[PDB]
Design a protein around this ligand. Structure first.
Ligand SMILES: C[C@@]1(F)[C@H](O)[C@@H](COP(=O)(O)OP(=O)(O)OP(=O)(O)O)O[C@H]1n1cnc2c(=O)[nH]c(N)nc21
Ligand SMILES: Nc1ncnc2c1ncn2[C@@H]1O[C@H](CSCC[C@H](N)C(=O)O)[C@@H](O)[C@H]1O
Length: 262
């Protein structure tokens, strides 16, 4: 038998494009980024606007205690830097190192002056899958590229977990790791072993789009992995089958201020 999430992916792939676009943001929470997009086009780096939607997703988890960034934070796949700049605003964070691939088709780090920007060092041109691990107090990873083929998303997710395993073995106190495809067998098998060793649990951020099944493995959660994943699959399938669509529920984006930290 298959996990319900496999069903969801098959049904997702059968939507027309118009159906898909009507579904992907139906009933999710979305922060309004109109001012942020104007800020990046105007080079406004002091207005507190996050560089991406990712900031609001990590804020959601941090304010619920699912991860408590502190000390030295390493941000794997930092992209423009939304997670890294957010952590540098936090009282217990002392240093943020972000690594991302960059180059054609990939986001380059953006230089911002949000609060605590001077604690952030972002490095492009870095393939984290071949980078030696380093010590960290907080380990973040937001990597996982979508595909219509669930076996490709499965393999991509397993590769992330095998990399994270090396970084966690350095001794990490807090973590938050994107699980792109949590319902496929090879991901479940690996995650269950890694939960046994390192703890944590899977959570679904309601800012995630209905067009993906992404969940985050976070140190400040617990709970059965199979049940957590199934709960998300049923929600996403329920939303796909309720065809009176409303678009997202809008909320306010994070304000990251400006200024250096001592
Ligand atoms: C093919 C996919 F399965 C993608 O593998 C997944 C994520 O496609 P996506 O790039 O939007 O990812 P998403 O936006 O959710 O994630 P974030 O940006 O928040 O990180 O949706 C499906 N998909 C994309 N386009 C279409 C489409 O035209 N028609 C249909 N039927 N399915 C589509
Ligand atoms: N092998 C790899 N090594 C390093 N970065 C990678 C990678 N594969 C993908 N990435 C990067 O992972 C990034 C995920 S971006 C995630 C959003 C980010 N947390 C924010 O808040 O802005 C992408 O920019 C992508 O280019």
């Amino acid at each position: 038998g298959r996990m319900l999430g496999e069903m969801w992916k098959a049904q997702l792939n059968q939507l027309t494009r118009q159906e898909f676009m009507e579904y992907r943001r139906d009933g999710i929470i979305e922060v309004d980024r109109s001012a942020a997009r104007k800020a990046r086009r105007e080079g406004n780096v002091t207005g507190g606007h996050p560089v991406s939607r990712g900031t609001a997703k990590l804020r959601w988890m941090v304010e619920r205690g699912f991860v408590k960034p502190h000390g030295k934070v390493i941000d794997l796949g930092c992209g423009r830097g939304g997670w890294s700049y957010y952590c540098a605003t936090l009282k217990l964070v002392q240093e943020v190192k972000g690594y991302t691939k960059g180059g054609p088709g990939h986001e380059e780090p953006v230089m911002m002056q949000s609060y605590g920007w001077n604690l952030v060092s972002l490095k492009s041109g870095v393939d984290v899958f071949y980078r030696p691990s380093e010590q960290s107090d907080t380990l973040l990873c937001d990597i996982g590229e979508a595909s219509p083929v669930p076996e490709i998303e499965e393999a991509r997710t397993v590769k992330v977990l095998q990399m994270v395993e090396e970084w966690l073995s350095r001794g990490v106190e807090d973590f938050c790791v994107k699980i792109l495809c949590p319902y496929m067998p090879k991901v479940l098998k690996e995650l269950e072993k890694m939960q046994l060793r390192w703890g944590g649990g899977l959570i679904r951020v309601p800012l995630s789009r209905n067009s993906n099944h992404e969940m985050y493995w976070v140190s400040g959660a617990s709970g059965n992995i199979t049940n957590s994943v199934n709960t998300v699959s049923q929600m996403l399938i329920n939303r796909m089958n309720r065809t009176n669509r409303n678009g997202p529920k809008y909320e306010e984006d994070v304000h990251l201020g400006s200024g250096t930290r001592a």
